[PDB]
Write an enzyme that holds these catalytic residues in place. Structure first.
Site, PDB file in Angstrom:
ATOM      1  CD  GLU B  13       0.656  -1.012   2.890  1.00 13.99           C
ATOM      2  OE1 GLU B  13       0.248  -2.169   2.647  1.00 13.99           O
ATOM      3  OE2 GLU B  13       1.775  -0.784   3.394  1.00 13.99           O
ATOM      4  N   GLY B  14       0.654   2.116  -0.975  1.00 16.57           N
ATOM      5  CA  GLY B  14       1.384   3.366  -1.066  1.00 16.57           C
ATOM      6  C   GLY B  14       0.585   4.505  -0.466  1.00 16.57           C
ATOM      7  CE1 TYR B  16      -1.552  11.581  -4.054  1.00  9.92           C
ATOM      8  CE2 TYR B  16       0.736  10.904  -3.777  1.00  9.92           C
ATOM      9  CZ  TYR B  16      -0.243  11.885  -3.729  1.00  9.92           C
ATOM     10  OH  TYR B  16       0.076  13.175  -3.361  1.00  9.92           O
ATOM     11  N   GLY B  17      -2.284   4.700  -3.651  1.00 10.49           N
ATOM     12  CA  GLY B  17      -2.941   3.456  -4.002  1.00 10.49           C
ATOM     13  C   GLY B  17      -2.283   2.216  -3.421  1.00 10.49           C
ATOM     14  CD  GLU B  79      12.328  -6.842 -11.926  1.00  9.27           C
ATOM     15  OE1 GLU B  79      12.742  -8.014 -12.054  1.00  9.27           O
ATOM     16  OE2 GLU B  79      13.101  -5.862 -11.920  1.00  9.27           O
ATOM     17  CG  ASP B 125      12.305   6.609   1.635  1.00  7.35           C
ATOM     18  OD1 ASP B 125      12.898   6.704   2.731  1.00  7.35           O
ATOM     19  OD2 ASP B 125      11.123   6.276   1.545  1.00  7.35           O
ATOM     20  CD  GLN B 129      11.628  -0.904   6.373  1.00  9.00           C
ATOM     21  OE1 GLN B 129      12.548  -0.205   5.951  1.00  9.00           O
ATOM     22  NE2 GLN B 129      11.561  -1.290   7.647  1.00  9.00           N
ATOM     23  CG  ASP B 143       8.562   3.645  -2.778  1.00 10.43           C
ATOM     24  OD1 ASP B 143       8.285   4.605  -3.550  1.00 10.43           O
ATOM     25  OD2 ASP B 143       8.011   3.501  -1.665  1.00 10.43           O
TER      26      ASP B 143
HETATM   27  N1  LIG Z   1       5.960  -5.737  -3.398  1.00  9.42           N
HETATM   28  C1  LIG Z   1       6.522  -5.928  -4.649  1.00  9.42           C
HETATM   29  N2  LIG Z   1       6.866  -7.121  -5.183  1.00  9.42           N
HETATM   30  N3  LIG Z   1       7.433  -6.893  -6.442  1.00  9.42           N
HETATM   31  C2  LIG Z   1       7.435  -5.606  -6.684  1.00  9.42           C
HETATM   32  N4  LIG Z   1       7.899  -5.011  -7.850  1.00  9.42           N
HETATM   33  C3  LIG Z   1       6.864  -4.933  -5.569  1.00  9.42           C
HETATM   34  N5  LIG Z   1       6.694  -3.579  -5.414  1.00  9.42           N
HETATM   35  N6  LIG Z   1       7.442  -2.741  -6.057  1.00  9.42           N
HETATM   36  C4  LIG Z   1       7.258  -1.383  -5.968  1.00  9.42           C
HETATM   37  C5  LIG Z   1       7.749  -0.551  -6.976  1.00  9.42           C
HETATM   38  C6  LIG Z   1       7.560   0.811  -6.902  1.00  9.42           C
HETATM   39  C7  LIG Z   1       6.891   1.367  -5.819  1.00  9.42           C
HETATM   40  O1  LIG Z   1       6.697   2.719  -5.753  1.00  9.42           O
HETATM   41  C8  LIG Z   1       6.406   0.543  -4.813  1.00  9.42           C
HETATM   42  C9  LIG Z   1       6.587  -0.824  -4.882  1.00  9.42           C
END
Ligand SMILES: Nc1n[nH]c(N)c1/N=N/c1ccc(O)cc1
Lengths: 257, 296
Positions: B13-14, B16-17, B79, B125, B129, B143
């Site tokens: 969970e970010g 914005y979504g 991916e 950042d 995590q 991220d």
């Molecule tokens: N939990 C996850 N498993 N595989 C990922 N690419 C993944 N998440 N990747 C991201 C990639 C960009 C982001 O802003 C937040 C998460």
């Protein structure tokens, strides 16, 4: 300096990939170079009003030219394109971007918020989200590190010239940001100090006075004609003490290249 | 297009979504889908994250595969990676992360970071995590929501950056300028954390974070860090702690390891080692690529 060469090399690759089509304006049924100048001059004013970075202005102009390279636009919608471009550039580049409400406000309610945000989406789609484009500004700041010694007037005057080139699609659409920056830097240096494009920048960039000459002779004319140009916002802007009032400096009569 | 993806489950969970694990129904490919809901239009963080990830193709950077661009929603297709480094360290209790895996992970992280920096991007950042690992021994930077494209030389950028525990001293002291060195500081903290399985500098406030750093590395003076006493949030009242014997900061670390950590935690950002230069450090002379077994 750890990454200075890698970054420069990478920006030289990206500016070729982010380059607008040099002839797009003749392919535009409704808009002209003069209409584009009017838009860009207004963007300068917008940047001044909201105290935006110069980089943000340069980015917005890059986005507009790329957008118009494949999308025909009626003259009544040119400002909508410019407005959404400036919003995108601000979101990308600024610590505190103006709010959408503010961009809607400076179009004199020519457009609605809904239109602006729909255009933002269309610009993003058309540019494939590729917003991280190299600008004249990003090359200048690198070139500035080759001064001996650094001179605030040279730096502000080079910024001023690079900015003037944004206004006139003819002739500047045909030159890459790195080349305009080299012309602007040499011209500024020569104007203020009498010095020329330094040997160290030949090594860095591969550009010489010979390869810069076509852009340089264009930019010198622009510099000489600047007081009479229909668009004056950039000259007004560079009167500020922020830019050491360089727009008040006299251009050289000749370059001797 | 979304019709080809079958949602498997939520995974994150970010702001914005949400992030979903999904599979491509036609190719079988397992992916992560970051959904960003769209009244200020496309969020600035998503504009940066997408524009920058598009240019960052590297084995040790999470791969943006596609962007699905509807009217109310933005979907980022990545991916899929199985687990983040934080979860992995928590599940590695009482076992430790073996040194060969620590070395491989740091070497990989440094390659991904050197690639970012060579492409004028600051991550801003880096923390366990945000580092993802797979079942093949890879670890990748993820991220990029707080990332930005920088210029040469840098301008003043956003001050509110980097999760506090991982935040470099030049940020805490309010320096007008920061650059790539801030990401190396973060990796330094993470390097130490992989070894000890506890955060190196777990402060609760900015001054607490600074004091924890000072007590470990010494309170910096003009000799160790020219200019430090004139920095905006430096205070002459700072207690003056002696620098620790550095073998005590991360005891299990060998001579080469301590050398590298100390260069990653160098006070002066100008003298702090770059990701590029770190790849050649003797610590990596025998680096391999072990494949850990993940619980999930
Ligand atoms: N939990 C996850 N498993 N595989 C990922 N690419 C993944 N998440 N990747 C991201 C990639 C960009 C982001 O802003 C937040 C998460």
């Amino acid at each position: 300096p750890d990454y200075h060469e890698d970054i420069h090399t990478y920006l030289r690759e990206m500016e070729v990939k982010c380059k607008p089509k040099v002839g797009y304006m003749k392919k535009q049924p409704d808009i002209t170079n003069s209409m584009r100048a009017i838009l860009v001059d207004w963007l300068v004013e917008v940047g001044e009003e909201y105290k935006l970075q110069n980089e943000t202005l340069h980015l917005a102009v890059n986005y507009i030219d790329r957008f118009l390279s494949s999308m025909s636009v009626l003259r009544g919608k040119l400002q909508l394109v410019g407005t959404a471009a400036m919003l995108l550039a601000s979101k990308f580049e600024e610590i505190y971007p103006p709010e959408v409400a503010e961009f809607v406000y400076i179009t004199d309610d020519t457009y609605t918020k809904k239109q602006v945000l729909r255009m933002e989406h269309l610009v993003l789609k058309v540019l494939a989200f590729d917003l991280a484009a190299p600008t004249i500004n990003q090359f200048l700041t690198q070139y500035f590190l080759h001064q001996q010694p650094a001179n605030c007037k040279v730096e502000s005057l080079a910024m001023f010239l690079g900015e003037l080139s944004l206004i006139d699609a003819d002739p500047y659409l045909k030159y890459l940001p790195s080349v305009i920056a080299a012309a602007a830097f040499h011209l500024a240096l020569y104007t203020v100090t009498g010095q020329s494009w330094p040997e160290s920048l030949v090594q860095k960039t591969g550009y010489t006075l010979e390869t810069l000459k076509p852009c340089l002779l264009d930019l010198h004319q622009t510099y000489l004609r600047a007081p009479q140009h229909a668009q004056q916002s950039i000259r007004e802007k560079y009167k500020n003490s922020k830019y050491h009032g360089v727009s008040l400096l006299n251009p050289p009569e000749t370059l001797n290249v | 297009s979304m019709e080809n993806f079958q949602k498997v489950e939520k995974i994150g969970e970010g702001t914005y979504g949400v992030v979903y694990k999904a599979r491509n129904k036609l190719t079988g490919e397992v992916v992560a889908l970051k959904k960003i809901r769209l009244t200020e239009g496309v969020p600035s963080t998503a504009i940066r994250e997408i524009s920058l990830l598009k240019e960052l193709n590297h084995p040790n950077i999470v791969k943006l595969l596609d962007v699905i661009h509807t009217e109310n929603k933005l979907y980022l297709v990545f991916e899929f990676l199985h687990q983040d480094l934080k979860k992995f360290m928590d599940a590695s209790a009482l076992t430790g992360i073996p040194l060969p895996l620590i070395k491989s992970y740091l070497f990989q992280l440094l390659q991904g970071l050197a690639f970012c920096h060579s492409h004028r991007v600051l991550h801003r950042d880096l923390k366990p995590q945000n580092l993802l690992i797979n079942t093949e021994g890879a670890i990748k930077l993820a991220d990029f929501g707080l990332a930005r494209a920088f210029g040469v030389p840098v301008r003043t950028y956003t001050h509110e950056v980097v999760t506090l525990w991982y935040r470099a001293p030049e940020i805490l002291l309010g320096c007008k300028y920061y650059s790539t060195a801030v990401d190396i500081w973060s990796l330094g903290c993470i390097f130490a954390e992989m070894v000890t399985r506890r955060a190196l500098f777990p402060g609760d406030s900015e001054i607490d974070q600074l004091f924890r750093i000072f007590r470990t590395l010494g309170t910096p003076d003009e000799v160790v860090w020219p200019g430090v006493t004139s920095m905006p949030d430096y205070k002459p009242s700072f207690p003056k702690w002696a620098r620790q014997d550095f073998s005590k900061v991360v005891p299990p670390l060998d001579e080469d390891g301590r050398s590298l950590l100390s260069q990653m935690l160098h006070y002066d950002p100008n003298k702090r080692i770059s990701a590029k230069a770190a790849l050649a450090h003797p610590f990596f002379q025998d680096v391999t690529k072990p494949v850990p077994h993940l619980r999930l």
